[PDB]
Amino acid sequence: NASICTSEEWQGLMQFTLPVRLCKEIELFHFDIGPFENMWPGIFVYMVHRSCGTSCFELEKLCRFIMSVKKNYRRVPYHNWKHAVTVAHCMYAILQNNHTLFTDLERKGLLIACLCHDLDHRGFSNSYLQKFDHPLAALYSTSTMEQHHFSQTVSILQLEGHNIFSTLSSSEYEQVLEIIRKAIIATDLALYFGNRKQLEEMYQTGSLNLNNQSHRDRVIGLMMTACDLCSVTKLWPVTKLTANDIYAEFWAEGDEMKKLGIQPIPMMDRDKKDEVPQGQLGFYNAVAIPCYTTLTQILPPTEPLLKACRDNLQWEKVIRGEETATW
Amino acid sequence: NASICTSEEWQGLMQFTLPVRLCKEIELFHFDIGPFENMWPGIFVYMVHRSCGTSCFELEKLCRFIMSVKKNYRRVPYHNWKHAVTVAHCMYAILQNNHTLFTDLERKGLLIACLCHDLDHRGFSNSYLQKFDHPLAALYSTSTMEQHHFSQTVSILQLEGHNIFSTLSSSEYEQVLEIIRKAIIATDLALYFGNRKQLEEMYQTGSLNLNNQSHRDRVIGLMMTACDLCSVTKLWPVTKLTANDIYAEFWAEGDEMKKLGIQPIPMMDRDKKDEVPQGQLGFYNAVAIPCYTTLTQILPPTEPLLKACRDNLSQWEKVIRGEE
Ligand SMILES: CC(=O)Nc1nc2ccccc2c(=O)[nH]1
Ligand SMILES: [Mg+2]
Ligand SMILES: [Mg+2]
Numbered sequence: 291n292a293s294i295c296t297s298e299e300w301q302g303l304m305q306f307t308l309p310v311r312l313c314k315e316i317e318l319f320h321f322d323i324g325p326f327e328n329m330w331p332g333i334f335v336y337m338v339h340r341s342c343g344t345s346c347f348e349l350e351k352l353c354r355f356i357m358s359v360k361k362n363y364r365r366v367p368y369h370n371w372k373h374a375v376t377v378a379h380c381m382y383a384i385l386q387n388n389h390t391l392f393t394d395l396e397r398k399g400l401l402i403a404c405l406c407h408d409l410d411h412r413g414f415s416n417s418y419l420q421k422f423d424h425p426l427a428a429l430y431s432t433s434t435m436e437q438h439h440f441s442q443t444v445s446i447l448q449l450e451g452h453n454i455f456s457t458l459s460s461s462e463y464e465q466v467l468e469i470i471r472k473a474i475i476a477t478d479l480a481l482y483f484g485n486r487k488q489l490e491e492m493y494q495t496g497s498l499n500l501n502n503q504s505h506r507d508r509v510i511g512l513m514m515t516a517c518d519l520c521s522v523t524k525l526w527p528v529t530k531l532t533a534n535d536i537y538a539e540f541w542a543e544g545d546e547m548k549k550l551g552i553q554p555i556p557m558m559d560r561d562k563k564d565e566v567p568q569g570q571l572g573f574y575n576a577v578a579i580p581c582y583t584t585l586t587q588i589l590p591p592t593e594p595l596l597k598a599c600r601d602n603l604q605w606e607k608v609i610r611g612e613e614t615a616t617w
Numbered sequence: 618n619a620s621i622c623t624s625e626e627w628q629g630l631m632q633f634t635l636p637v638r639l640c641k642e643i644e645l646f647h648f649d650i651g652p653f654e655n656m657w658p659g660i661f662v663y664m665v666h667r668s669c670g671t672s673c674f675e676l677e678k679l680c681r682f683i684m685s686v687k688k689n690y691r692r693v694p695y696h697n698w699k700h701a702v703t704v705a706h707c708m709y710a711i712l713q714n715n716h717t718l719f720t721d722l723e724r725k726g727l728l729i730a731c732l733c734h735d736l737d738h739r740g741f742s743n744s745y746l747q748k749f750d751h752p753l754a755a756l757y758s759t760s761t762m763e764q765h766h767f768s769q770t771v772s773i774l775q776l777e778g779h780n781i782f783s784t785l786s787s788s789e790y791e792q793v794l795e796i797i798r799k800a801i802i803a804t805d806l807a808l809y810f811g812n813r814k815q816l817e818e819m820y821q822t823g824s825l826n827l828n829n830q831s832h833r834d835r836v837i838g839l840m841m842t843a844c845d846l847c848s849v850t851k852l853w854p855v856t857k858l859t860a861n862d863i864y865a866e867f868w869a870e871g872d873e874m875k876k877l878g879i880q881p882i883p884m885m886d887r888d889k890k891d892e893v894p895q896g897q898l899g900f901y902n903a904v905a906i907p908c909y910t911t912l913t914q915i916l917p918p919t920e921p922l923l924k925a926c927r928d929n930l931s932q933w934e935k936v937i938r939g940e941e
């Protein structure tokens with residue numbers, strides 16, 4: 291059920307070398323992958339090697355893994371290959387800034403979970419699948435797509451010469467598959483609200499303890515949300531262009547809903563585009579700002595994500611009619 | 618309504634020789650014509666001679682054509698004669714680095730099309746013309762300015778001692794005028810998006826075939842867009858002074874709203890320049906980077922344009938973040 295890369299695809303990736311000027315750039319939270327498309331698989335290799343080491347994974351198996359993950363992402367406006375690399379780069383920057391708080395297993399596990407977190411996404415939300423009683427909704431009653439993304443990751447790992455974790459002990463393998471399962475499942479935003487409220491309580495009451503596994507799982511969960519939403523932490527024109535992609539995907543689902551005799555929520559209605567700036571203000575106040583605020587409290591070196599998010603919350607200027615030119 | 622040039626103008630250009638110091642510099646994609654105002658028509662003659670040969674056009678007719686083309690460029694802030702020569706130099710560098718891919722008819726057609734691409738521009742976008750109901754919109758319905766620029770080119774070619782293509786066979790003249798029309802039309806940015814999307818698909822699926830005329834036409838169109846936007850491919854001190862160019866059409870319209878006693882919305886207002894570096898970042902990511910990426914895929918020797926565009930994108934980021 292998992293697509294497989296060609297020998298030409300993985301062989302080419304093995305040869306790739308990151309340009310010198312990008313090495314400085316890639317370490318920054320605000321780094322936008324957008325203008326380096328041909329370099330995306332190559333950028334992931336580089337992040338895995340700098341964070342985990344060159345001998346952490348067998349080069350051929352990792353290059354086959356990367357290229358098959360690329361092939362298993364669909365041609366959808368937002369939950370695509372670019373989004374996967376974007377989310378992985380944000381994880382990398384959080385990891386580099388908080389390196390010793392995480393074990394080698396968690397680091398390789400989280401970078402792999404970020405690259406695969408939306409594998410085989412169809413441009414449809416859990417709301418859609420659960421309403422239109424799709425087989426995925428019967429198979430996965432809760433966090434529908436997120437369980438499907440995790441299943442897809444396992445399926446790519448099970449391909450010939452794709453098991454990048456083969457060199458781990460049967461215990462460590464089971465440990466990494468669990469790190470990945472919980473991290474992919476934590477990308478379901480329905481789970482974020484409860485997770486964030488719990489972390490805020492643990493942090494404020496001073497009970498938060500990074501050596502307590504249940505606490506680590508929550509902090510990892512918030513890191514997954516933070517990386518998944520990282521378009522809101524880029525420079526404004528980058529943020530705005532990605533918001534057009536997100537809405538292009540939401541509106542195509544609203545279109546599919548109409549044909550099926552059900553009217554969509556305003557956010558998924560292409561005839562309600564005027565409601566977008568207020569909806570973004572609502573999303574930033576209810577989700578993005580609280581996420582990065584709690585994450586900065588737990589991991590202070592992540593402070594730039596919060597600053598960049600407050601800067602984009604630009605949406606206020608848009609609502610007041612002071613926006614700039616589009617191309 | 619086409620304008621001719623004086624005897625003194627075309628004659629002075631015939632005497633022109635490019636200074637040696639510029640012979641290798643001009644071959645570079647990032648070459649800036651900026652400091653050489655007096656040499657602009659001469660630089661174009663030099664480029665035609667090097668690309669098409671000295672026997673391509675009768676010197677006198679060519680020099681007459683060029684001086685009339687210059688005449689026919691209004692004193693607008695962006696879509697002026699400087700722009701025309703900048704665009705033509707970028708076509709020269711693309712053509713020279715892909716020396717075996719283009720026919721003699723395509724090379725002469727494209728350099729002339731680039732020099733003539735923005736003929737008699739008034740500083741307004743096609744959006745404004747069919748909004749404020751300008752007379753040009755009544756003349757030309759779609760790709761309003763581009764249809765006008767080609768009308769203006771045919772208008773100049775039909776003037777006495779200006780048909781630089783009179784030395785061609787019945788079919789060859791029809792072939793060249795078609796290349797030019799298609800090339801000037803392709804400069805309508807509104808057409809670029811769909812063209813580039815189609816080319817991406819073709820290249821990726823392996824269906825791109827340069828033996829196929831409609832495929833050549835599409836590739837030529839993307840080259841016209843690449844040349845049209847080339848200020849983004851210059852060195853930083855040259856590009857940093859080019860920030861207001863992409864805003865020229867928004868501000869032209871705002872100026873017209875200001876003439877109706879209407880303070881326009883900030884994006885159309887020239888006194889609101891604080892968003893200019895952010896507008897550059899947005900234009901590079903949405904327009905220029907994809908253009909140069911697709912162009913480099915089809916024509917690998919064009920890679921320096923993509924590199925220089927990426928370099929300036931990084932400089933604009935630094936400006937926004939307040940690091941330079
Ligand atoms: C209204 C709303 O939910 N907007 C929205 N905006 C987003 C912007 C960036 C990344 C993710 C999102 C997202 O999930 N939702
Ligand atoms: Mg997801
Ligand atoms: Mg034009």
Ligand SMILES: [Zn+2]
Nearest residue numbers: 407408477518
């Ligand atoms: Zn995601």
Ligand SMILES: [Zn+2]
Nearest residue numbers: 700734735845
């Ligand atoms: Zn132009």
